[PDB]
Amino acid sequence: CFGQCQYTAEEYQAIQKALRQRLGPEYISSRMAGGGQKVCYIEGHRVINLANEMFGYNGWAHSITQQNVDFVDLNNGKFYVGVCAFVRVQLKDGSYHEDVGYGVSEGLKSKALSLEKARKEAVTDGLKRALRSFGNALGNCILDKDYLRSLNKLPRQLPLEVDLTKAKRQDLEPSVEEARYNSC
Amino acid sequence: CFGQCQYTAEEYQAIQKALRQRLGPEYISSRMAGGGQKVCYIEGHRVINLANEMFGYNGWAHSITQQNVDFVDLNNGKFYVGVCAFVRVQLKDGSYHEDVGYGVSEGLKSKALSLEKARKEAVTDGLKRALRSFGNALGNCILDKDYLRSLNKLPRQLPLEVDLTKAKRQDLEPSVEEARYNSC
Amino acid sequence: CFGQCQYTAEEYQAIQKALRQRLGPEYISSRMAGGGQKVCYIEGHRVINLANEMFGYNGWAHSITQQNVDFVDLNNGKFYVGVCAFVRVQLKDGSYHEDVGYGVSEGLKSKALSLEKARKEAVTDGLKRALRSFGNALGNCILDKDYLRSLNKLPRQLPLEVDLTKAKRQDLEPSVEEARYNSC
Amino acid sequence: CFGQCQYTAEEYQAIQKALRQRLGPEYISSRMAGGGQKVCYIEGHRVINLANEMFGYNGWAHSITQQNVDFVDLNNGKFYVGVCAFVRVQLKDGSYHEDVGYGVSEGLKSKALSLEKARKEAVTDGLKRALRSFGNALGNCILDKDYLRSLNKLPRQLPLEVDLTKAKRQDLEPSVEEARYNSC
Amino acid sequence: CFGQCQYTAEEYQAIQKALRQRLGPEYISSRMAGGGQKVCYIEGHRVINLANEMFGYNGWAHSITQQNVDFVDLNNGKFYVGVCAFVRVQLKDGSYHEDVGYGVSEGLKSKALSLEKARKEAVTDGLKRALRSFGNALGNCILDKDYLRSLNKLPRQLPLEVDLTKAKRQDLEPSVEEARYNSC
Amino acid sequence: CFGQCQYTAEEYQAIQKALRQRLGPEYISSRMAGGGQKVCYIEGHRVINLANEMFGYNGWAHSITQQNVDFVDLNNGKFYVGVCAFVRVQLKDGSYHEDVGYGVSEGLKSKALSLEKARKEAVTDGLKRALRSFGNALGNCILDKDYLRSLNKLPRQLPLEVDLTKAKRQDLEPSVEEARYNSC
Amino acid sequence: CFGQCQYTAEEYQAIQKALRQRLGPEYISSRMAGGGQKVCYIEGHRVINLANEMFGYNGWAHSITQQNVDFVDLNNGKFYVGVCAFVRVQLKDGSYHEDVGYGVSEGLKSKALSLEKARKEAVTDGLKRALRSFGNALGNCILDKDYLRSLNKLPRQLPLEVDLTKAKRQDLEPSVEEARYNSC
Amino acid sequence: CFGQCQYTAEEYQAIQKALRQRLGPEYISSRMAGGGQKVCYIEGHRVINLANEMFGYNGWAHSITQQNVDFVDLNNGKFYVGVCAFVRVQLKDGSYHEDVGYGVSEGLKSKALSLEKARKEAVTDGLKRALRSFGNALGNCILDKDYLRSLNKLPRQLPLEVDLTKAKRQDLEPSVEEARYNSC
Amino acid sequence: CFGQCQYTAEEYQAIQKALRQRLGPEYISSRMAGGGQKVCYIEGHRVINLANEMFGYNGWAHSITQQNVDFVDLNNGKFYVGVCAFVRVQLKDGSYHEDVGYGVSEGLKSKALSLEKARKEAVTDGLKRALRSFGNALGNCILDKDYLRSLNKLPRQLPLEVDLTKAKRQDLEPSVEEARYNSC
Amino acid sequence: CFGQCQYTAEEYQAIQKALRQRLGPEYISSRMAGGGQKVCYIEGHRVINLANEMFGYNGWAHSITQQNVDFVDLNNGKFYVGVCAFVRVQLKDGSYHEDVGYGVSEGLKSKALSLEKARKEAVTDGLKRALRSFGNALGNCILDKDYLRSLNKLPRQLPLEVDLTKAKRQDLEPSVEEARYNSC
Amino acid sequence: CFGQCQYTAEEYQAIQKALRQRLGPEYISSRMAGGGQKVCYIEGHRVINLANEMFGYNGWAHSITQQNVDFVDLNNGKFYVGVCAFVRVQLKDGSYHEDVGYGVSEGLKSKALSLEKARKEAVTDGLKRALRSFGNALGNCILDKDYLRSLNKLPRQLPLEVDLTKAKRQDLEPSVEEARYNSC
């Protein structure tokens, strides 16, 4: 099962090579560092899908070891919250990597919304930082300065159109339901 | 049994493909962010059924690792409550994902009702964020901006009529009761 | 035994299909939300029997992970109590779901009665919310708005008459006592 | 042994059916709710014997997970005590249900007696509410309103005469002592 | 061994039936409830012997899960002590029942004697309440009102004369010493 | 070994019968209850030898689960101490009974001697009460009122003369040393 | 090994008989009870050798479950110390007996020497009281009043002369060293 | 699996030799020590990839044993934060090394940003320091002074151009997906 | 291994006999009890060598269960320290004995030196007291008064001259190194 | 695996001999003791490489049992920090040695930098001191005074030139990647 | 492996004999007791090498059970620190011995240096004291007064000259690398 399974030579080699790949500009994003420059990053749902593809929906897993709210300060009706979270990712073979994630909220007048924001972000930021340990294909390149420069020198493509034609429209999954029944 | 069972090739493949699917507009919903714009999300019962289909009623499970009431403030007879919950989802093979959920209640004059709302919501919010990790089909797309735009550019269909003709009207389940008896 | 046993293909398929069923109006009830509208819900004993049927008296179980009394306030001779309970339900194969239940009591002059009410309700509310995770047949539809509308558009039938003719009148159970003796 | 044993198809089916039965009026009792109406309930020793029959003296078990004394107030020489208890019932196959019980004492001048009453009641109430989870035959009907009305519409029979002719009059049990000696 | 052994069909059936018996008036006793009426109960050594017969000296066992002294008050030279104890009884097959026992001491000038009384009584009271769970022959009848009335309607027999002719007068037990030596 | 061994039919039967015996007047003793009447009890060393014979030096065991000093009060140079002990007795087959003992010291001017007396007595008291659970032969009769009356109605025999002729006079045990050597 | 080994019939019987013996006057000693009479006891080293003989240097074992210093009071330059120790003795077969021991020091001006005396005595006392549970041969008779009287009625023999001719004079042990080497 | 697998002669030898290698200037970087000289170090993503190559994405793992925020001081609107983290790296064969990492932030006005920096750096710094323990190829040379001098005496090469032509542009990985499917 | 190994008949017998021996005057020493008489004792290194011989360097072991510093008092520049230690000795077969040791320092002006002295002595004293439990050969005689008198009545021999001719002069041990290598 | 593997005669013998070697001057370094003389030591990276060679990158491991910050004092803008670490080194066969390391920082004005220095140094110091236990080749000679004198009487050689021609220049390791793949 | 392995008769006998040896003057050293006389002791690295030779680099192990800083006093700019350490030493067969070590620093003006000295010394001191338990060859003689006198009566030889010609000059160890590779 999980934690038990050992990678086969074929899967090992494939994944080992694959993880080396660098991400295209279709994955990177940016925000304006407070006072600083443009900071690139990969959106959460991206990294999640990347993983599901690299290891399969049931080939990787993560858990929150711990989340600690550093502080919740109030400066004239505005809330400044700092939160950290420790996430640990594990592959089906027992292999694992753990890292710290950090969430922040410095404006909002709502305390609830400030926490919700910091807590959720800290986790995702943790999961992402943890998966980067597996290779460039999961984000380890995002840190490489040389990598970044090579990104600007590229055609700043425009958002991809999402074709929702073959989108799931109802619950049932005959293909799946069948395979499963034959699994008993 | 659960946590033991390993996915067969057929089921694995089926589920792995299925999970890639994006959700149709029949799954999305929206609220008016306080001051913000329109926020899309998927209702809980939806995500639950999606999973019961993707993995089977007994192919997935979840538990609340911990729930912490961040605060319960009283501003002139009105209650402002913030709650967070950590939910861990596991598949029958041992695979697992865990995330934070957040519940909020900022109006109500009733303390009881304010907490009930925040505690319940934090959990459901947690379970949803947890299953998102498994793929788009369980909500990982809901975050994708490109995905969202492609949703507006679609026929805003009207609520589906629920045919309660073949609805369950009594307790007994002969089909089930039979297969079970033969299981002893 | 329990937690050990794995579902046979027959039983798995039956239950998997059965759980999809939506409940008939014979299961729903309503209360008048304080200020709000009509709130639908399924009475506890209902959800219990639904479960004993879907899984067998010994095919499901539940336990109280934890129950915490949120507050016990006294406003002019009246008690306002808020209680939460975490219930975990487990099927015979190890499968499980856990959720928060909430109990409330806002009128009563009796402290004892206010707590008894809030504690007991929190548990049952927890148990119900946990079972909902298994599918529509155990309550997951009760949340579906489309489901609800289709309920109103139905013949508001009248309470079912309970035929107590074949009701149990004494302790002994020959049919059972026999099967058991032959089980040694 | 206990927790190990699995139900045989014969015993499972028998008990499964029996538990569906509804209790006759020979099991129901009533108290006058403080201000409220008539409340129906099943006396403790009743639920005990019902279970010793449905599962055999050694087929079910319960334990007190926890008992917490909520409060012990003194209002002018009179004691108001509220106690809760969590009881877990388990069948010989590992199956289990756990619920909250509540004990109350609001009159008495003796503190000792006030606690003895609430603590013992809380336990029994817990055990009864736990067993209800198994089915109607163990009290899940007592909650059904429809069930109740049908009870009033019945011949309010008079207390049963207890024939103490074949009552146990000495310690020894030749029948048992024998089977046991042959068990070594 | 103990906790391991499973009941043989012969023993199970015999004990199951015997436990249904109701106790004769030779087992009941009475005290004058403070202000209340006559309270019937079974002395402790009685319940002990009843159990050593129903299950054999080594077929049942009990332990004190916990004992808590609720209070020790001093009202003008007199002590008022309230103690509770949780006792768990287990049969050789793993079967078990646990209950609360209560001990009370309200007059005495001696603190020591007051506690000694309450602690010992709480335990025994706990043990008796736990054994009642097995059936009428161990005290589950003592609670039945119908049972009680039938007791009054009986010849209030006089204390049994104890024949101490064949009473044990020395330590050694040849019969036993022999069987044991042959057990090595 | 101990806790493992299961009683053989021969031993089980012998001990079962033997434990039923009532103790002769050679076992009983008495003290003058402070203000009360004559209290009968069995001296510790007696109960110890009774057990060593009924079960063999290695057939039974006891441990002090816990000992709590309830209080140590000083009233004008005199110490008043109350102590309780929880003793658990176990037979070689795993069978077990646990009870509370109580030690008291109300006169002494020495604190040390007062505690020593209470702590020691509490344990012994506990051990005796625990063993009583096994049967009359181990003290369960000492409680029976009918038993007691039958004791007075007997020839108050005079102390037994102890013949120290065959008393052990040196350490070595040839008989033993031999059996042991052949045990390797 | 230890706690594993089971006594063979030969050894069991031998030890079971030998433990019944009563100690000769060569084992008893006496102190003058502060104000009280003459108190008989068995010196520590004696009980140790008795045990090493009854069971073999490796057939019995003891551990200090706990030692608690009750108090250390200072009355005008003099220290009054009370200490208790719980000792558990175990035989190679798993059999065990645990008791309390107590140590006292009431004169000394040295705090260190008072504690040293109390702590050490409490342990030895504890060990002796524990061993007493195995039989008269290990001290259970020392308590018997009838035994004591029979002791005075005996020739108060004079201290035994210790022949140190065959006393060990150097470390090595050829006999042992040999057997051991052949044990590898 | 992981922690279980043992290195084969071929892989052990290869890795053993590889780890000896010193890093080229393509790996080293520098910062201006506050007041001090030029400090060389290896950026995190570098060390990560180095490891993924030396051991394979699933041949090594790390976890945060603990992270402690040493201090968070505020000197005139500026935050001074110090954090330490303990990271433990483990190879697939059970081999392991653990070290301390330290994160620092001494300028920033934002508390949130000051912690995020320190916490994240402390972890990476820890992971790097732990990996150094495996050999020069993972950073152990970076400390060697002689090594450093030989680095300046080298052609200070210019940043490497990153060719993003064969960069990953979409989620799916056919090569992998295939190998995986054949792994079931 | 250790704790596992069981003594062979040969070794058991040899050791059992040997332990009976009494120590010659070559083992005893003396100190002048503060105010008291001459106190006899065995130096530490002696007891150690005695044990290494009786059991083999790997046949016995000891651990410090606990060491508590009772007090550290300062009376005019001088330190008075009292420390106790609990030592547990175990033989290779699982056999064990545990005792209390006590360390004292009452003169010294140095706090450090006072503690060093008492902590160290407490342990050794503990180890010695624990080994006594195995027999006279390891010190159980040192307590016997009769033994002592016989010691004075002996030729107070003069210190033994130590022949350091065949003393170990270098680290290597060819005989050992050889047997070891062949042990692989 | 690790902790499991047992050395083979060949490897044992080789390492046993090699560990005896004394380090050449190429390993020693020196600092100027505050006020004291010249202190010799071995740089961290040296010991690490020495161990990777003696045991193999996967033949030894270490962990930080605990790290405690002793003090952080501030004397006029300067920080004096003392820290200790307990490191435990383990060889692949289970063999292990543990020691204390100590880190110090006494000048710096920065608190962060002072701690980082002390925490890091304590661990490295710990690791070095722990590895010394394995023999001279890992630093045990560094203590030997005689060894040190012989070092001064030697040609104080000049720093070794590091040839970075065959230095690792890219991530991939073909030799390794190959062997690994064949390991699946 | 370690803790598992059992000594072979050859190795046992060899070590058992060699441990008896007394150390030559080449192992002893001395310090001038503050006010006291000349104190003999064995230097740390000596004991370490002695052990590596008696047991093999992987035949013995040690750990620090606990280290407690007794005090850190400041008397006019000078620090007086007292520290203790408990060290447990274990042989590959499971055998073990634990002891207390003590570290002291009474002059220094630096707090850091005072602690570093004491903490380090306490551990080494503990380690030596623990190893002594194995026999004279590991230092148990260093205590013997007769042994010491015999040392003075010997030629106070001069420091041994350390021949660093065959000293290790580079990391690699061909002999070992070979045996290891063939071990896979």
Short mmCIF file of N, CA and C in Angstrom, two decimals, chain K residues 55-111:
data_model
loop_
_atom_site.label_atom_id
_atom_site.label_comp_id
_atom_site.label_asym_id
_atom_site.label_seq_id
_atom_site.Cartn_x
_atom_site.Cartn_y
_atom_site.Cartn_z
N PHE K 55 37.23 -4.31 23.30
CA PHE K 55 35.97 -4.66 22.65
C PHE K 55 35.81 -4.45 21.15
N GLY K 56 36.73 -3.74 20.52
CA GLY K 56 36.59 -3.48 19.10
C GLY K 56 35.88 -2.15 18.98
N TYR K 57 36.18 -1.38 17.95
CA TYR K 57 35.54 -0.08 17.79
C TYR K 57 34.00 -0.17 17.84
N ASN K 58 33.47 -1.33 17.49
CA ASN K 58 32.03 -1.55 17.46
C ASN K 58 31.56 -2.57 18.49
N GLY K 59 32.34 -2.78 19.55
CA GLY K 59 31.96 -3.76 20.55
C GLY K 59 31.40 -3.12 21.80
N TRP K 60 31.58 -1.82 21.91
CA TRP K 60 31.09 -1.11 23.06
C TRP K 60 30.48 0.20 22.62
N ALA K 61 29.60 0.75 23.46
CA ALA K 61 28.93 1.99 23.13
C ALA K 61 28.58 2.70 24.40
N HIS K 62 28.32 4.00 24.29
CA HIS K 62 27.94 4.75 25.47
C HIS K 62 27.00 5.86 25.09
N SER K 63 26.17 6.27 26.04
CA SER K 63 25.25 7.36 25.80
C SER K 63 25.13 8.17 27.07
N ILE K 64 24.66 9.40 26.93
CA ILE K 64 24.50 10.24 28.09
C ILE K 64 23.04 10.13 28.49
N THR K 65 22.79 9.46 29.61
CA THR K 65 21.43 9.31 30.09
C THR K 65 20.86 10.66 30.50
N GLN K 66 21.68 11.46 31.16
CA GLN K 66 21.25 12.78 31.57
C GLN K 66 22.38 13.65 32.05
N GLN K 67 22.28 14.96 31.79
CA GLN K 67 23.31 15.85 32.29
C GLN K 67 22.60 16.99 32.97
N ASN K 68 22.95 17.22 34.23
CA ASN K 68 22.34 18.30 34.98
C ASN K 68 23.37 19.28 35.55
N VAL K 69 23.18 20.56 35.24
CA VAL K 69 24.06 21.62 35.73
C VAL K 69 23.60 21.90 37.16
N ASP K 70 24.41 21.52 38.14
CA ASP K 70 24.04 21.71 39.53
C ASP K 70 23.96 23.16 39.97
N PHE K 71 24.89 23.98 39.51
CA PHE K 71 24.87 25.36 39.92
C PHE K 71 25.85 26.17 39.12
N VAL K 72 25.61 27.47 39.08
CA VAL K 72 26.48 28.40 38.38
C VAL K 72 26.53 29.63 39.26
N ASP K 73 27.51 29.68 40.15
CA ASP K 73 27.64 30.80 41.06
C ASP K 73 28.69 31.80 40.65
N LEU K 74 28.46 33.05 41.04
CA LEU K 74 29.36 34.15 40.73
C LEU K 74 29.87 34.84 41.99
N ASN K 75 31.16 34.68 42.29
CA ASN K 75 31.80 35.30 43.44
C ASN K 75 32.87 36.24 42.93
N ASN K 76 32.56 37.53 42.96
CA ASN K 76 33.46 38.58 42.49
C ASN K 76 34.12 38.29 41.14
N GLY K 77 33.35 38.41 40.07
CA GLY K 77 33.87 38.19 38.74
C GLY K 77 34.37 36.80 38.37
N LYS K 78 34.34 35.87 39.31
CA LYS K 78 34.79 34.50 39.04
C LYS K 78 33.59 33.56 39.09
N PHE K 79 33.58 32.56 38.21
CA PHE K 79 32.49 31.59 38.16
C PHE K 79 32.85 30.24 38.75
N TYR K 80 31.92 29.71 39.53
CA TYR K 80 32.06 28.41 40.19
C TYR K 80 30.90 27.57 39.66
N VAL K 81 31.21 26.65 38.76
CA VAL K 81 30.19 25.79 38.18
C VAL K 81 30.37 24.33 38.50
N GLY K 82 29.24 23.69 38.82
CA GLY K 82 29.22 22.27 39.14
C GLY K 82 28.24 21.54 38.24
N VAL K 83 28.71 20.50 37.56
CA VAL K 83 27.86 19.73 36.66
C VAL K 83 28.02 18.23 36.78
N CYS K 84 26.92 17.51 36.63
CA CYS K 84 26.98 16.06 36.72
C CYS K 84 26.42 15.42 35.46
N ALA K 85 26.90 14.23 35.15
CA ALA K 85 26.43 13.55 33.97
C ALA K 85 26.28 12.08 34.28
N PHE K 86 25.25 11.46 33.72
CA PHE K 86 25.04 10.04 33.91
C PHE K 86 25.30 9.39 32.56
N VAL K 87 26.28 8.50 32.52
CA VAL K 87 26.67 7.83 31.31
C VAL K 87 26.44 6.34 31.43
N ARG K 88 25.88 5.75 30.38
CA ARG K 88 25.61 4.33 30.35
C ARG K 88 26.49 3.76 29.26
N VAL K 89 27.21 2.68 29.56
CA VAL K 89 28.07 2.02 28.57
C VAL K 89 27.48 0.66 28.29
N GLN K 90 27.45 0.25 27.04
CA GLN K 90 26.86 -1.04 26.73
C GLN K 90 27.71 -1.85 25.76
N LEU K 91 27.79 -3.15 25.98
CA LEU K 91 28.58 -3.99 25.10
C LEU K 91 27.65 -4.57 24.05
N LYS K 92 28.22 -5.04 22.96
CA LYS K 92 27.43 -5.56 21.89
C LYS K 92 26.47 -6.65 22.32
N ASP K 93 26.75 -7.32 23.43
CA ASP K 93 25.86 -8.40 23.82
C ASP K 93 24.70 -7.97 24.68
N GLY K 94 24.64 -6.69 25.04
CA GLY K 94 23.53 -6.22 25.84
C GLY K 94 23.98 -5.81 27.22
N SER K 95 25.05 -6.43 27.67
CA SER K 95 25.63 -6.11 28.95
C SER K 95 25.77 -4.57 29.09
N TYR K 96 25.58 -4.04 30.30
CA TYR K 96 25.73 -2.60 30.49
C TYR K 96 26.09 -2.17 31.92
N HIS K 97 26.66 -0.97 32.04
CA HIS K 97 27.00 -0.39 33.33
C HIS K 97 26.82 1.11 33.21
N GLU K 98 26.17 1.72 34.19
CA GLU K 98 25.95 3.16 34.16
C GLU K 98 26.53 3.84 35.42
N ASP K 99 27.05 5.05 35.29
CA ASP K 99 27.60 5.76 36.46
C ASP K 99 27.45 7.28 36.32
N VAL K 100 27.78 8.01 37.40
CA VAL K 100 27.70 9.47 37.43
C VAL K 100 29.06 10.03 37.22
N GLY K 101 29.14 11.14 36.50
CA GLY K 101 30.42 11.78 36.28
C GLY K 101 30.24 13.17 36.81
N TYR K 102 31.33 13.86 37.14
CA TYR K 102 31.17 15.22 37.63
C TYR K 102 32.16 16.17 36.99
N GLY K 103 31.69 17.37 36.67
CA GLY K 103 32.56 18.35 36.04
C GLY K 103 32.61 19.60 36.89
N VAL K 104 33.79 20.19 37.02
CA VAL K 104 33.93 21.39 37.83
C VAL K 104 34.79 22.46 37.19
N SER K 105 34.47 23.71 37.50
CA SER K 105 35.22 24.86 37.01
C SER K 105 35.08 25.88 38.12
N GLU K 106 36.18 26.29 38.74
CA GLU K 106 36.06 27.22 39.84
C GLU K 106 36.79 28.54 39.73
N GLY K 107 37.59 28.73 38.69
CA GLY K 107 38.31 29.99 38.58
C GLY K 107 37.77 30.98 37.56
N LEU K 108 37.93 30.62 36.28
CA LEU K 108 37.52 31.43 35.13
C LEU K 108 36.58 32.61 35.34
N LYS K 109 36.78 33.63 34.52
CA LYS K 109 35.96 34.84 34.56
C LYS K 109 34.88 34.73 33.49
N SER K 110 35.10 33.83 32.53
CA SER K 110 34.14 33.61 31.46
C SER K 110 33.11 32.56 31.87
N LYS K 111 31.84 32.91 31.77
CA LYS K 111 30.79 31.97 32.12
C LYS K 111 30.80 30.83 31.12
#
